[PDB]
């Protein structure tokens, strides 16, 4: 094949042009996103039961939903969260790889069969299914800087004149609103209701009757009488469209003209649907929008379009409004693209410089510069054809594979140049001989790299996708590079080389070149005689090999393991949990204190604090609170003392003094879609039907037991809310009936006075909005106030609510959790800074084994993924080992020679482990990928050396020692050149300061250690293995 | 409160979450 294309340079040029065109077309159209679909598909069902405690929502709503959601295939695990506010959330997480667009239909259809089995209020509110594993492209906050608009006004303005336009641009998927639009609130007044002899049911009936739409029909009906010529539409009563119209609703009119109006008994205003969440941006009331990227869309273009559309609206922005972007993900993608371009340019310049330094010929230097971009475009085209995207992992694989492309180019060019120098033949025949000698080795190493990288893509779960991106990119790059080396490069060696005379290797000239050649030749002679001397003996270095092996094993065992390193994303969360029974006022005070601290003592680091009151990751309620703190750009935060870790450590140290609140601060995981906390999630599940008190006592005992080992477990905290006092009202049914009061009236009054009822819909400024009915604050705020409400009996008299009702106190849980259909509770927390996660998991399992009988344990979230390393058992590494053994035995006919090649594998793993231990990084996915790359490079060097030695031994009559020494003398310049190129090209990865530098640091350190140690300890060791294998198996 | 509390007693108002029975504490009056 290579000699075939040598005589036809333009055939190779045509193939290159086709590949370049394919790469350009691929780069023209390709989705761009921060991360691929890494998290497993998840569907969340949300339902609302206004003014209902946790128990009512749990038994009457989510029980029926959970019962009727059985039979869904590919279901991994289900969780359920009820609340005292009245919201229930059921999250179903499926297996990885399934089509979510069908699972959503399945769960929705199964839910629609249980709709008539739910109470009426939840049906009127409505339930909604959605996909929670989508991640937020950006959040757009809108704030008021004068004090006119409130949260409700801002939310309605966004819902009316911002949501549609922002949703109707290009590339935008789901758009979520963090507020609620307007709603006509009707605040009763018990004094006025008693004055006119009315009850809330009368107001509800009047609103239902006087705020309806009637199908009037049509003038000149559908069957017309003979001789009709007029036809029109009749417009009868319609929905009320203003507060002044709602205030004129009649409630009681006598025959003499006396009337009672709704405004005479209640206050009508325009408010929100629920006053449960208060959002303040830097101390000002604010609302927000969440924009998610649609599938198969460009992130940067969508962001630019969103920014332009938002900047269009300022002339029409009313009053004082400001638009801010607390959190967006585009800078990471821009940084990734910039790093890719920088690495490509640096590699090209570096390889040109090193080729000029060594080969001294410009025509030799120019050959790879017109070959590496061809392979890059081919990789782009193949990756586009397969169905991948431009993530932050594929480009990392490309910057990793640049070294492989450079290695192939260096090998081919150096071999042809040395053949020409030592043979005297001109470029044509020298290229023919070199290609004929090296084609088998090239095919063998391509097959070896494919065999070592493909099985990594067969992992399951999130790790499966993370490995899949790198594996696909690497194998595509290797295949394209070897195809290019077979087709395009031999033509280049045929045409663009100068046939210089033998012996003119720069020794005829002085300066840097001749002198450098002098020490290079002297060092080559020294190395050759040294390796000959060491090869004279065999058993002296077997003990060194065993020492290296045992040291590598000890380092592998000692090195801690984790899942994925933390990164400085510029955003971190702060959580506030007040004691049980705390109201909104104290939470607002604590949030104000936190905001003041952040904006006063960290002015040079933070940029804005988006405080949210009433909602927390643990559980919604008037007891918790959250705050998303965003930092300035990484350019303005120099040093390691101004990163996320130091900032959050100082923040929690300072917040430890905040009384009446346990304020914590933490950093969100690098992949935001998978989980919300950086630590493991552990779940205790009741099985023997103990109840709730036993479960709580067991959880407290386990927490105390785990807190007694402050060496591997840190920040072990519950994820729920503790039990709270509750008010119990008991109505004397027979007393109420005796007095003449119907039970229905009492129940309706109690449910519409303190809980609030949703009655009808109305048209406001050209849109549909609900109307809500509830008492006016001061009459529903203390227990004694329950005596202020009056109910009409049959006789027409009004009886007070305190004449037939009592009251008492109780204890109840404000948040009930369920896992897989059983009551359960969750403990979430990280591990020690100096130990592996798996050891903490094992110790937590051992601690849970000591629990009282009847309580089981389980994992969820990333922990479950960490428990999916059963495929990471040697059952897969061994498969790869046998596959590469078979490939090596097939490349050259021997069942024993590949042992020498495999013996070089530990010599790079030892260096990778040394670098990891020196830097202190843990064993994670990126380090594993770098280790595999180093193993592949060492195997490539071993393949080249062994193949050259075997060819010299077989084709000619050279003896074992003589052929081995000649081969190792011959394969010295390419190895050193490739090692120098790789080591110098991976400098920025190790030296990277910030901007998502954790993965870069880990991979660069692993690559540096592996490459340096393999280059140092392979030239001296591979010949020993070769000669030992040949003599022992002679 | 009708019974249980006497004149001159001290009742904690803040720091309840971070405190536990039978622990020495620094008590300060708040306004």
């Amino acid at each position: 094949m290579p000699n075939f294309f040598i005589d036809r340079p333009i055939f190779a040029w045509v193939i290159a042009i086709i590949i370049m065109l394919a790469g350009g077309l691929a780069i023209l159209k390709l989705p761009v996103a921060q991360y691929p679909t890494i998290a497993p598909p998840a569907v969340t069902i949300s339902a609302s039961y206004p003014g209902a405690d946790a128990k009512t929502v749990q038994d009457t709503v989510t029980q029926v939903i959970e019962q009727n959601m059985n039979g869904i295939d590919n279901l991994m695990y289900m969780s359920s969260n009820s609340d005292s506010t009245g919201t229930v959330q059921i999250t179903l997480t499926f297996e990885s790889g399934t089509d979510a667009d069908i699972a959503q239909v399945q769960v929705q259809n199964k839910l629609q069969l249980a709709m008539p089995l739910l109470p009426q209020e939840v049906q009127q509110q409505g339930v909604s299914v959605e996909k929670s594993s989508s991640s937020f492209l950006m959040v757009v906050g809108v704030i008021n800087t004068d004090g006119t608009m409130t949260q409700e006004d801002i939310s309605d303005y966004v819902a009316a004149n911002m949501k549609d336009a922002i949703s109707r641009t290009s590339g935008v998927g789901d758009v979520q609103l963090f507020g609620s639009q307007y709603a006509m609130r009707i605040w009763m007044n018990p004094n006025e209701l008693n004055k006119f002899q009315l009850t809330p049911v009368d107001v509800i009936t009047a609103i239902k009757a006087q705020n309806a739409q009637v199908a009037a029909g049509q003038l000149g009906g559908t069957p017309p009488v003979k001789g009709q010529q007029l036809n029109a539409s009749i417009i009868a009563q319609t929905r009320l469209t203003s507060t002044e119209e709602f205030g004129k609703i009649l409630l009681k009119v006598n025959q003499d003209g006396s009337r009672v109006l709704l405004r005479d008994v209640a206050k009508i205003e325009l408010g929100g649907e629920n006053y449960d969440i208060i959002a303040e941006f830097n101390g000002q009331p604010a609302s927000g929008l969440g924009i998610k990227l649609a599938t198969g869309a460009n992130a940067l273009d969508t962001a630019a379009a969103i920014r332009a559309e938002l900047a269009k609206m300022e002339p029409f922005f009313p009053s004082g409004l400001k638009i801010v972007y607390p959190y967006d993900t585009t800078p990471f993608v821009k940084i990734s693209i910039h790093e890719v371009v920088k690495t490509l340019v640096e590699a090209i310049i570096l390889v040109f410089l090193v080729m000029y330094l060594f080969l001294q010929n410009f025509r030799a230097t120019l050959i790879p510069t017109i070959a590496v971009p061809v392979v890059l475009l081919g990789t782009f085209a193949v990756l586009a054809a397969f169905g991948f995207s431009i993530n932050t992992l594929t480009m990392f694989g490309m910057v990793l594979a640049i070294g492989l492309l450079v290695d192939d180019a260096i090998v081919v060019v150096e071999n042809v140049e040395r053949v020409m120098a030592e043979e005297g033949l001109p470029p044509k025949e020298a290229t023919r001989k070199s290609m004929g000698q090296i084609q088998g080795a090239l095919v063998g190493i391509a097959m070896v790299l494919s065999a070592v990288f493909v099985p990594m893509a067969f992992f399951g779960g999130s790790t499966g996708a993370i490995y899949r991106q790198f594996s696909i990119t690497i194998v595509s790059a290797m295949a394209l590079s070897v195809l290019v080396a077979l087709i395009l490069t031999p033509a280049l060696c045929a045409t663009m080389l100068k046939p210089i005379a033998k012996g003119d290797h720069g020794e005829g000239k002085k300066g840097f070149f001749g002198w450098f050649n002098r020490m290079f030749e002297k060092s080559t002679h020294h190395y050759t005689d040294s390796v000959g001397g060491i090869l004279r003996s065999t058993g002296r270095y077997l003990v060194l090999y065993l020492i290296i092996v045992v040291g590598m094993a000890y380092l592998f065992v000692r090195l801690p393991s984790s899942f994925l390193p933390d990164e400085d994303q510029g955003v971190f969360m702060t959580m506030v949990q007040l004691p049980a029974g705390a109201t909104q006022e104290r939470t607002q005070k604590v949030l104000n204190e936190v905001t003041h601290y952040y904006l006063t003592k960290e002015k040079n680091n933070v940029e804005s604090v988006f405080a949210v009151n009433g909602f927390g990751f643990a559980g919604r309620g008037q007891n918790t609170g959250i705050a998303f703190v965003s930092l300035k750009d990484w350019a303005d935060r120099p040093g390691e003392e101004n990163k996320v870790e130091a900032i959050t450590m100082r923040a929690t140290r300072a917040f430890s003094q905040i009384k009446d609140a346990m304020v914590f601060a933490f950093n969100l995981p690098a992949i935001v879609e998978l989980g919300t906390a950086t630590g493991f999630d552990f779940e205790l599940i009741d099985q023997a039907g103990l109840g709730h008190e036993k479960l709580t006592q067991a959880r407290n005992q386990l927490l105390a037991e785990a807190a007694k080992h402050p060496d591997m477990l840190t920040s072990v905290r519950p994820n729920g809310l503790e039990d709270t006092p509750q008010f119990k009202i008991d109505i004397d049914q027979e007393k109420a009936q005796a007095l003449g009061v119907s039970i229905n009236d009492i129940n309706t009054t109690l449910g519409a006075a303190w809980g609030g009822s949703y009655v009808n819909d109305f048209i406001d400024r050209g849109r549909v909005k609900k109307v809500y009915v509830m008492s006016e604050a001061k009459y529903r705020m203390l227990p004694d106030d329950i005596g202020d409400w009056y109910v009409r009996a049959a006789d027409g008299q009004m009886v007070p609510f305190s004449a037939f009702s009592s009251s008492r106190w109780e204890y109840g849980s404000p948040r009930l959790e369920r896992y897989n259909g059983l009551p359960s509770m969750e403990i979430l927390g990280q591990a020690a800074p100096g130990k592996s996660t798996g050891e903490a998991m094992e110790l937590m399992e051992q601690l849970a084994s000591k629990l009282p009988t009847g309580v089981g344990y389980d994992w969820t979230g990333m922990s479950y993924q960490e428990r999916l390393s059963g495929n990471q058992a040697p059952s897969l590494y061994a498969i790869s080992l046998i596959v590469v053994f078979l490939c090596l035995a097939a490349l050259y006919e021997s069942w024993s020679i590949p042992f020498s090649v495999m013996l070089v594998v530990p010599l790079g793993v030892i260096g990778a482990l040394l670098a990891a231990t020196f830097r202190g990084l843990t064993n994670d996915v990126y380090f594993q990928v770098g280790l595999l790359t180093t193993i592949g490079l060492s195997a490539k060097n071993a393949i080249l050396i062994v193949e050259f030695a075997k060819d010299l031994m077989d084709k000619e009559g050279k003896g074992l020692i003589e052929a081995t020494l000649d081969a190792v003398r011959m394969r010295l310049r390419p190895i050193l050149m490739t090692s120098l190129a790789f080591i110098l090209g991976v400098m920025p990865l190790v030296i990277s300061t910030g901007a998502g530098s954790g993965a870069q640091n880990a991979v660069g350190t692993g690559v540096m250690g592996g490459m340096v140690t393999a280059t140092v300890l392979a030239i001296f060791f591979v010949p020993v293995f070769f000669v030992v294998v040949r003599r022992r198996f002679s | 409160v009708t019974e249980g509390l006497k004149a001159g007693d001290r009742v904690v108002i803040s720091g309840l979450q971070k405190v536990r029975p039978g622990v020495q504490v620094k008590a300060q009056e708040v306004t």
């Binding site: 009384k659 | 504490v25 008590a27 300060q28 009056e29």
Partner: peptide, 15 residues
């Protein structure tokens, strides 16, 4: 370290 608490003083008064 030593935990600190904010405490109130109980004194009778007519209402």
């Amino acid at each position: 370290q030593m935990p600190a608490v904010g405490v109130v003083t109980v004194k009778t008064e007519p209402l």
